[PDB]
Design a protein around this ligand. Sequence first.
Ligand SMILES: Nc1nc2c(ncn2[C@@H]2O[C@H](COP(=O)(O)OP(=O)(O)OP(=O)(O)O)[C@@H](O)[C@H]2O)c(=O)[nH]1
Ligand SMILES: Nc1nc2c(ncn2[C@@H]2O[C@H](COP(=O)(O)OP(=O)(O)OP(=O)(O)O)[C@@H](O)[C@H]2O)c(=O)[nH]1
Ligand SMILES: Nc1nc2c(ncn2[C@@H]2O[C@H](COP(=O)(O)OP(=O)(O)O)[C@@H](O)[C@H]2O)c(=O)[nH]1
Ligand SMILES: Nc1nc2c(ncn2[C@@H]2O[C@H](COP(=O)(O)OP(=O)(O)O)[C@@H](O)[C@H]2O)c(=O)[nH]1
Ligand SMILES: [Mg+2]
Ligand SMILES: [Mg+2]
Lengths: 55, 432, 426, 433, 436, 66, 42
Amino acid sequence: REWSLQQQREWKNARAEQKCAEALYTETRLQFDETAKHLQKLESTTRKAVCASVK
Amino acid sequence: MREIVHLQAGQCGNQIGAKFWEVISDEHGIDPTGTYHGDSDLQLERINVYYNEATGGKYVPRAVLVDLEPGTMDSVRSGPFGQIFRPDNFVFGQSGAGNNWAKGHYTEGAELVDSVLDVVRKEAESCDCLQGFQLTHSLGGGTGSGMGTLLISKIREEYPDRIMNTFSVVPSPKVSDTVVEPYNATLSVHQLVENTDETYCIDNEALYDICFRTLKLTTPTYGDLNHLVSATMSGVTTCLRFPGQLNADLRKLAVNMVPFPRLHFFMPGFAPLTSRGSQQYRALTVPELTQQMFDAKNMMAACDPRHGRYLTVAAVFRGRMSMKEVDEQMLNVQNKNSSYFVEWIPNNVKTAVCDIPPRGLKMSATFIGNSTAIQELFKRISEQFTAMFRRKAFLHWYTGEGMDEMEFTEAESNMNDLVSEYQQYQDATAEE
Amino acid sequence: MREIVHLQAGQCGNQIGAKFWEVISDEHGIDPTGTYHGDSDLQLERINVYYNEATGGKYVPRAVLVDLEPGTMDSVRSGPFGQIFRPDNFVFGQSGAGNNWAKGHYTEGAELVDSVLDVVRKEAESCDCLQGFQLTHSLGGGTGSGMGTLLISKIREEYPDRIMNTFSVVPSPKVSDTVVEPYNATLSVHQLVENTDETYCIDNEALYDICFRTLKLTTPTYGDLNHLVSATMSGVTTCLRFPGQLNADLRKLAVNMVPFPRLHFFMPGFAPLTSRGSQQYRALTVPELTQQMFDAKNMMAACDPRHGRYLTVAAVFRGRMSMKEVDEQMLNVQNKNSSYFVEWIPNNVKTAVCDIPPRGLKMSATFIGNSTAIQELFKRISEQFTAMFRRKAFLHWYTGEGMDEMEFTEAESNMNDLVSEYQQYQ
Amino acid sequence: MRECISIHVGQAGVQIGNACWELYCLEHGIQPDGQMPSDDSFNTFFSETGAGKHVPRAVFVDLEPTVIDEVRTGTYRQLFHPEQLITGKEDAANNYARGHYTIGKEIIDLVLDRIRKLADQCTGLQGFLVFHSFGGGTGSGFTSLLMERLSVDYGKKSKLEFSIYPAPQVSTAVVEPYNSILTTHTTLEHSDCAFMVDNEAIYDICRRNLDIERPTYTNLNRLIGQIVSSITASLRFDGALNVDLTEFQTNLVPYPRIHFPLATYAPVISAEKAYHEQLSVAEITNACFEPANQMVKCDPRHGKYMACCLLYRGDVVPKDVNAAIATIKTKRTIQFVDWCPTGFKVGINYQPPTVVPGGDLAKVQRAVCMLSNTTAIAEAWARLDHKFDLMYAKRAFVHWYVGEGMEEGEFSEAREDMAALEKDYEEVGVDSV
Amino acid sequence: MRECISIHVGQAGVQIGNACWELYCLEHGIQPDGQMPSDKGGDDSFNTFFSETGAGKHVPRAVFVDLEPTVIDEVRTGTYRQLFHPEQLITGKEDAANNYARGHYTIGKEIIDLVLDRIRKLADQCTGLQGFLVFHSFGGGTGSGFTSLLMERLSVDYGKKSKLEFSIYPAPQVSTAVVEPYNSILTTHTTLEHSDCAFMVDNEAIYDICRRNLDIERPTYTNLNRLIGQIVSSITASLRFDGALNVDLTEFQTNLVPYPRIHFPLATYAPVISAEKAYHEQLSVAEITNACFEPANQMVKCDPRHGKYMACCLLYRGDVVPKDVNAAIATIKTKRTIQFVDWCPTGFKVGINYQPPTVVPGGDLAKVQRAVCMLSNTTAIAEAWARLDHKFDLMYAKRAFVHWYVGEGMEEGEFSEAREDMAALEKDYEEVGVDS
Amino acid sequence: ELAQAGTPAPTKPHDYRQEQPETFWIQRAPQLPGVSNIRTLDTPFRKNCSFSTPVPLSLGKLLPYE
Amino acid sequence: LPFLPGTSFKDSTKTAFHRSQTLSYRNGYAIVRRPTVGIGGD
Ligand SMILES: Nc1nc2c(ncn2[C@@H]2O[C@H](COP(=O)(O)OP(=O)(O)OP(=O)(O)O)[C@@H](O)[C@H]2O)c(=O)[nH]1
Ligand SMILES: Nc1nc2c(ncn2[C@@H]2O[C@H](COP(=O)(O)OP(=O)(O)OP(=O)(O)O)[C@@H](O)[C@H]2O)c(=O)[nH]1
Ligand SMILES: Nc1nc2c(ncn2[C@@H]2O[C@H](COP(=O)(O)OP(=O)(O)O)[C@@H](O)[C@H]2O)c(=O)[nH]1
Ligand SMILES: Nc1nc2c(ncn2[C@@H]2O[C@H](COP(=O)(O)OP(=O)(O)O)[C@@H](O)[C@H]2O)c(=O)[nH]1
Ligand SMILES: [Mg+2]
Ligand SMILES: [Mg+2]
């Protein structure tokens, strides 16, 4: 009984640590996606400004 | 472990399914962003039926939106719950069909099926044990009826031993929102009778009558009609995703309602629909659910079962309730109106019970009826089709785009054969 | 210990070659100066494969840049990563080939091979145990196709028992960026079939397809196309410089791909490429990689594998993953599709697994597929070579440089026989 | 040493298994965690573990995960072994052919493997008890080849059969007669004894007796569990006159084709109505003979009592048992066959029945369960033959069986076989020449 | 005094060696540095595997041979860099690359002298040699080719020494190469003539075991090699630890191998259970001895219900008693499913060891009281060989991949000769299995 | 409903990877046939070959009962 | 931002694209000059 309890407690701790690492990866991915969207918006605005200057 | 792949054909299909996904997203607790914000551990027990997993706890629907006019696609994508669908699942053509079944089936709708079957295969082998396919469309248009039937006839040859459900908005008897709607409806039903496993007929007359007389609404917009249709669509597949005392899947309902392979046209109904005035003046009981289900007013088709005979009946209940009173009430309603049931089948009614009711509600129920009162619809459509076909109305449009003249005659022959089969199964006797 | 020498020919070879060295200088943490600025100590375990050690902890690439005009070599040197190349490795003439195969093979390119083989012999003998060579060129030009096949037949006589790879950009069906394109494309494929171990067919039409419907780029300049090619060149050799559970080098893939020595034309692909809008609508699993890897929209050559039979197939995975799920997916695609795979070879697909994914990404895969449907590429050129040749168009630019006219009829019969080797295995 | 193996098939089997095993756990004083808070009376049902735990000797089988997953995430998630709960992927969906041919063959291997492991652990096995329903697809189809394989694998082991029959009036399906006719070859040839119950009768009992205005399947399955516990309590607990699984088969089955008894229980009364009632042995054995307390919708006054087995629990005296039997035997209302002068078997057990929290029955001192074999079953079979032939006249629903593997001659041969079974009962019950 | 020499050839050999030697160090209490903290002599159980230096260090008796550096350098850089000898990790420069010819004729002749020199040094250190244990894989180039001439040289150098062979066979359905049947036919001479006892395993069966037993949805090569290490430890524990009735290597070779041409047992281990299912099961002797006979628990994709059992060797470890052993064997002998041949009436050999198996932290198995390992010599291996002869004939019908093998140095006769050798070895099994 | 007692308390400290399970053999270790000299505090079932080794090829070791 | 096939961006407000000559010939020798200037004079 004691051995099985200790083994499954340690397995649970390992799975929790893996879940936390995956959460950190998803947060960094979300930050990169937001930066990419902002950069695309900036590039489109600069292109429209250049065309208006030419006209 | 039983996935349902959703198919949307036409502008009508896009509107109905765009309401349907909102309703079951609210049912399973899904925000407009896509994540899960709910207060139960039971809502994620069976969520893989309609949703595919994503990263970061997101769920995306297993649905495809097929159309030839991207205006409805833009309307769906700009909606409130429009940011949940994957951007690749919108399959939009470049030229419309223009209410032409020939344009839908042969000329412009024959080049879109390659991309549509590609996306359908990608969403079909992604499932573990796929249960079947579902379609939502209307037989009065050009894209839903013209090319949706082509999609059915392709995917059923691809996947023979699966199940195919259809929600068809068959033409209204008095509205006639299109001049050539009997042409489209006849040429679509002639394919549906061979290539469809279950068909559900939905009528705007019935929806208007319910939303006017029952719910007592001043302005019945299409949002309320799509809400009613989506409530029926959600109530059909409830036992797959919510546990109950007596489960029932789409295959089981097909088994217990389809005695012969050409008799698979159903009329639906929903049970507790009450107005704001009469909400407090009514107690929620199983007799008050069965009465409202079996009332001929509450049918979602413009066909009256007092002219016909109930071949089979299915009922799906939702809520914590008593098996004794459920079986007692449905035996009682079977016994009382003894002339509205056939005599060569005992126990015409299948019953199912699911535990979990919809939100804000205590008890509910859904009725699916196979009767012979559906041949009235086919007789009316056939008489209008043969009303135009002797004077050869509108026929150059269909003939100049690749159709022979024998197609219309064989559609007439198949439709007349189906209505004569329905008549003989109504008039059949016990002694033989 | 297992070194790879990079050869760049043409302006197409130089623009692909300059983007390639920008990619793996970021994998190994090499700044534009040339030094090392990285976080892991495993990045310097196998860096002698591509770089030469210099004084002060500076690494220079083992690449030689060959062109008959410095017009493109000036644009490479003025870029961000234009300071890493050794200034003695730039080999250049003063007269262009003019998109002529005869000038680039016999007249103008014959002088320039005196200087290239002094540089190639200097870099090849400095290694410990040379794995093989590598080439980047185009078959529709004068420098890439003319002299780039003169270098192949000269370094294979010197080094016969090695690995010769080519990343050749074949002509496209409807693009046609050269009027005399099939003369240079037919006379170069005739030289590749006898003198090359592995050949990767890349088409600029297929790279336009990926940047439109997969990446959803509004303005896909050639900086992005040369990224797609360079993400495949670093994925093939990623088991040479990174540890893994099951690793495969350049030689191990060529053994398991080529059943007969004439059949060595492949079709590359890369897997986790996703548009920016659909970044959050997708889950990362091994079945997500294997689905996109075998996609017919994802091949880098303008040949559809649905019209032919997969002879052999490879996949080189990257990232930490389970060996059951890798071996389960390659079996699953073979059992369902029993018509796109040959019947006298069971288990067509080979698998390799690396442990270090590209930076900022969790998993990757590179696809190498030998297919019968590559005969579509050689049959649409042989119908355009024969269309021009029977009216004898443009021969005075070729026959006027001494080239015999029977060499044109030999290039037909070697390439018309090649499409008949492929037909009998379909 | 003496032990039984429970095999529950279908959704009905799994629900009855839940309601039976809760009663067994409370009867033997085992927590839902599986540990006894602290005599080998549990050894008939529970098996010891190397962690000090008790694991049931039961196999739950189903073709869908929706009903087994409630057991897996319920209160008794720790008690059951995780490999005793066998699940398919797609259910048979009210089809005999799906459950027998196409879908049963993927899990028959796993079910036979677990059955082999349990019977290898059994040092001496009394038999298998099979809990199933005729109407459902899995219970109709998979159970047929389950018993067919068990008959080949095991020679003379006992196979008791608790089955759900369709009700004469109410039903939960349409193809219920089709699924119920085709099992009358397996339950005829490859079954040893088969008790049949139907839910409308138990609805009547719970409505009239226990004062419950709205019974549920829990309120039915608890009564079924009480019956099964009263049957097996002679094995489990010491008593004055023990009876055995082989023993009542010997004393109740006169011919190999006649193994369809009727199971009744008494007293079934509420806690308020038990407060004013003096329940003597005669007062509990008179209620078993009443047709209003039968558990099948059939009347034994049309038939002849062929054999009777009584099982008493509690503060019961053999003198008063004999006096009650003597008072029963003098009634002209109850008729016995001429070829059985002494028709009774008597078992007496000391331990009273156990009350459950939240249940509907009352705490009682004595109780009785009766297994009576009579000739009032031909009416119940013919009342279903009317429905089956009325459906089969027009070949309704029959493509849904033909296209999935089975030929159409199986319908006719099963109808003819069970028709001969119906005919045999009349010459069994006719008066001697 | 009793000693065994481990020879790990190829990437599979190196990885199985890592997973084995971690287990050996942890079982004998040796730190990754190489020193035992528990020195408070009197202990000799490590002398089978570890040689003791006077400085207090214990060096393994293993040789890691490889033709590529990418996996030997992981060993040289990782946790056990200070444990292994610097010269016991032999590495080449260019690998064979799935080529029997490259591994046998061209590349292997450069390093075979170094390998034989280190083998000579280890066997000279050994005062009495039980034998060699060769860990290799059939599919790969080095394991297919270099091991062949390594064993050809070892048979000449060492006459009567036992050479046990832990081989990875190609899986019948899944695989990781395409010239794998071509390499797996050509080693059927060097595993037939130059081996004493050959245990074949394949990855698909161990994938199935780790799927349905340990509840690992995504197993890896570490999870497979841990089970293989458990098997080798259960074989060698009779030499290493005190037991009631000990079994030696020559002893179970005698009791397992009936003819010189027939030396192909099947290895099974029980119980392979997880810590969540160790709570709901008692692992008695009569129940761990029935899991070895189940065809689902076999480590080769073959069904022994089709064949005839010829001999069995059972090795029990832990809380196990002869009364329960005899009762369980009596229970097994009465089943009509398990069939023995007529000329082997007493078909069992039994060994018992006192010390229960150890556990690795972070591992997959559970801490168990007792365990059993079975080596069964049967007839149901001819199906596993025919399932790959089919693939070899299918490829060789039209001479695919033949120029690769021909150009490096062999001739084309070895393909047909090796296929004929496999055909004769397949006919011999049915000739033996036919009763009288 | 009602109250359920938890897991029983351990009377002695337990830690896996270090603790040897009880056997009949480890309860009666000095009294068995087949057990060698007991000089290891970890397990009594580790082989001691001090007596069996020859007088040559023997390091400094302690003979049994001496 | 990670270095990826789709993550590249370029400056739009650039107007001078003059290509300087770092490789040329003096006497008979191919010379290579240090690139003291970029594209456009920057
Ligand atoms: N007495 C009793 N009968 C039940 C109970 N639950 C279900 N049933 C019976 O089960 C029959 C329907 O079959 P189910 O048990 O629901 O499902 P199944 O037997 O597994 O068959 P499939 O649904 O096709 O898989 C009905 O006729 C009910 O009479 C129960 O709790 N008590
Ligand atoms: N069980 C198991 N098998 C392995 C492992 N690693 C590799 N293999 C097997 O090895 C085979 C491939 O050959 P390898 O051993 O990897 O390579 P090799 O023997 O050195 O031959 P070359 O690569 O040509 O040098 C595959 O079929 C795998 O099944 C492992 O860790 N465990
Ligand atoms: N019930 C319902 N019917 C609709 C809806 N939208 C359109 N329709 C019906 O669909 C018919 C026209 O369909 P149409 O748009 O031409 O279909 P399409 O050509 O395939 O796009 C009309 O008869 C409408 O009554 C809706 O939201 N709900
Ligand atoms: N993929 C890719 N193709 C290119 C690039 N630059 C040119 N090409 C292609 O190369 C072909 C002509 O090459 P060319 O300039 O004649 O090569 P050269 O004669 O050796 O200098 C054209 O069809 C272009 O499409 C590039 O940067 N990337
Ligand atoms: Mg079921
Ligand atoms: Mg190797």
